[PDB]
Amino acid sequence: SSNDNIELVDFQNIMFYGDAEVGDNQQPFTFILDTGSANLWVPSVKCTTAGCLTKHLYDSSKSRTYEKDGTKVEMNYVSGTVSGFFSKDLVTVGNLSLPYKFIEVIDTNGFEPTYTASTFDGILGLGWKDLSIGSVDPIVVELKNQNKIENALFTFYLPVHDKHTGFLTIGGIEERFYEGPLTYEKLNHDLYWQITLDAHVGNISLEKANCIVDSGTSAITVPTDFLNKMLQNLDVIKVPFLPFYVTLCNNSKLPTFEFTSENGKYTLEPEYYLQHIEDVGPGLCMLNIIGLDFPVPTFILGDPFMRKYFTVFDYDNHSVGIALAKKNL
Numbered sequence: 001s002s003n004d005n006i007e008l009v010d011f012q013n014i015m016f017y018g019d020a021e022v023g024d025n026q027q028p029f030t031f032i033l034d035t036g037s038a039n040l041w042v043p044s045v046k047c048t049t050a051g052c053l054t055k056h057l058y059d060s061s062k063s064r065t066y067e068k069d070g071t072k073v074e075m076n077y078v079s080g081t082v083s084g085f086f087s088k089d090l091v092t093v094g095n096l097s098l099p100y101k102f103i104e105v106i107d108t109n110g111f112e113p114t115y116t117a118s119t120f121d122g123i124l125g126l127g128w129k130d131l132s133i134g135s136v137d138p139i140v141v142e143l144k145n146q147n148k149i150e151n152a153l154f155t156f157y158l159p160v161h162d163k164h165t166g167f168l169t170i171g172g173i174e175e176r177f178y179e180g181p182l183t184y185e186k187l188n189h190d191l192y193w194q195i196t197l198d199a200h201v202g203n204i205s206l207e208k209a210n211c212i213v214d215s216g217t218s219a220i221t222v223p224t225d226f227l228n229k230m231l232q233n234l235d236v237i238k239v240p241f242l243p244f245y246v247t248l249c250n251n252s253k254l255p256t257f258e259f260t261s262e263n264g265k266y267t268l269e270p271e272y273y274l275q276h277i278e279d280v281g282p283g284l285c286m287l288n289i290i291g292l293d294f295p296v297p298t299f300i301l302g303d304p305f306m307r308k309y310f311t312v313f314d315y316d317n318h319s320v321g322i323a324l325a326k327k328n329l
C-alpha cells in the first residue's frame with residue numbers, strides 16, 4: 001500500500017532484522033522491531049568497545065539536524081550494563097523522516113559478547129509512551145500527529161520462510177498479508193501492547209491471562225507451573241542447568257497452545273513451537289518455550305505466534321488485532 005512497508009529480513013528463522021537510517025547523512029543501521037522497547041537506541045562512533053567497531057556507528061557531527069540534550073541515560077538491564085546520552089536527530093524509516101529523541105549509547109559491555117555475535121547494531125521502539133524514557137512519544141503516534149500517516153497503526157509480516165519476505169505496513173492494513181478473519185481483543189492496559197485471554201492447553205486451564213505479543217522475544221513464554229503440569233510424560237527431554245527442552249519432531253503427545261476469548265479464538269501448533277535442532281542430533285526438535293512467572297498471570301506471544309498470525313496494533317482502537325498470516329507467496 002502507499003503506506004510505509006518496512007521489509008523484515010529473515011535470520012536463522014529465529015529473528016527478523018529491519019534496515020533503517022538515522023541522521024542527516026541517513027547513516028544506515030540494522031534494527032530489530034520490539035513491541036516492548038520504546039526510546040530508540042543508536043550505536044555511537046564515541047563507543048570505545050570492540051563490539052561497537054565491528055558494526056555501524058552513528059556520528060553526531062555529520063548531521064545538520066542533530067540536537068544534544070546532554071541528559072545522561074544509564075540502561076543496566078539484568079546481567080547487563082549500558083550507558084548513553086539523550087540526542088535528538090532526523091530518524092528516517094522508509095518514506096518517512098521525523099525528528100525523534102534517541103539514546104546515544106557509548107557503553108555496551110554487559111551485552112558486548114551477545115551483540116558482537118549478533119548482526120543487529122541497534123533496536124526498534126514501537127510501544128506506548130508509558131514505557132518510553134524521558135516522556136518520548138511513540139514513533140507511529142508522532143507520524144499520525146504529522147501529515148505522514150492517517151492512522152496510528154502498524155502491522156507485522158514476519159518472513160518465517162526463507163523465500164517469505166517480512167514487511168511492516170505502517171499507517172494501514174493490507175488484506176493481502178492476512179488471510180481469513182481479523183479479530184481484535186481489548187487491552188488490559190495502555191502502558192504497553194498487552195491483552196487479556198484465557199489459555200487452555202487440553203485439560204490444563206488458566207483463564208484471564210495477560211497475553212502480551214513481543215516481536216523481540218523469540219519464543220512463547222508460559223507460567224512455570226503451567227509449563228510442567230502440561231508436559232507430563234509427553235516424551236519431552238529437558239536440559240539440566242540450561243533453560244531449554246528437546247523432543248521428538250513427530251510425537252503425537254505434543255499439544256496445541258490455544259487462547260480463547262469473547263471476540264474469537266487463536267491456536268499455535270507444534271510446527272510453530274518446535275525448532276529443527278536435528279543439526280546436533282537428527283530427528284530431534286526443541287520446544288521454543290521459555291517458562292517464567294510474573295507478579296500477575298501473564299503469557300508471551302513472541303516470534304512463534306506472530307510468525308503464524310499476521311499481527312495488527314492500533315493506539316487509536318486501544319486493541320491488538322490478529323489474523324492468519326497469508327501462506328508465503
Ligand SMILES: Nc1nc2cc(CCCCCc3ccccc3)ccc2c(=O)n1C[C@H]1CCCO1
Nearest residue numbers: 034036037041042075077108121122123216217
Ligand atoms: N524486548 C525487550 N528488550 C529489552 C531490552 C532492554 C535493554 C535495552 C537497552 C538498549 C540496548 C542496546 C540498544 C542498541 C544498541 C546496543 C544496545 C531491557 C529490557 C527488555 C525487555 O524486557 N524486553 C521485553 C519486552 C517487554 C518490554 C520491552 O520489550
